[PDB]
Amino acid sequence: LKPEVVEELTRKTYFTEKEVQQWYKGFIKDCPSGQLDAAGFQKIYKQFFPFGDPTKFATFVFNVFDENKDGRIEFSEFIQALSVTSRGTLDEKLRWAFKLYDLDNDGYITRNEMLDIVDAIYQMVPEEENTPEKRVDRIFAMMDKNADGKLTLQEFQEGSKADPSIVQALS
């Protein structure tokens, strides 16, 4: 990695210079080209979940990693996502997830968008939660405060902080 790149990523993340270098070394070992593809990205999820189909979910995640939307995950995009998810504040992690779930990038997560997300998660992996639809109904019942079938960032952030298991999950 070049020094100006190194300095820039340190300045933009919760990592030190040495930590950024160590991550680069790890990133290049797993992805020698330095330009991670959809398939490459999917293997991360097949671990953790080797008994479902992570194709759909892996795509949604690949798109929020792909900050410049050029079709590849380069290191700077990888390290920045990683900064948020491993060391972000709860608010920051929730912003990033909001961005993951807001498929059309308006300022709203519709029930349908959330449905696509939860269904993809189910395909990747209790009676009350045994279908995506039940999970989504539970989410909107807790978080959609004005009952318009859409979650704003605030609704999402506050709704997620209200639930102790979400707080626990994002520790």
Partner: peptide, 12 residues
């Protein structure tokens, strides 16, 4: 990479 997984899929 476990943190990526948790932050991504937590809403389920």
């Amino acid at each position: 990479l476990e943190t990526v997984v948790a932050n991504s899929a937590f809403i389920a």
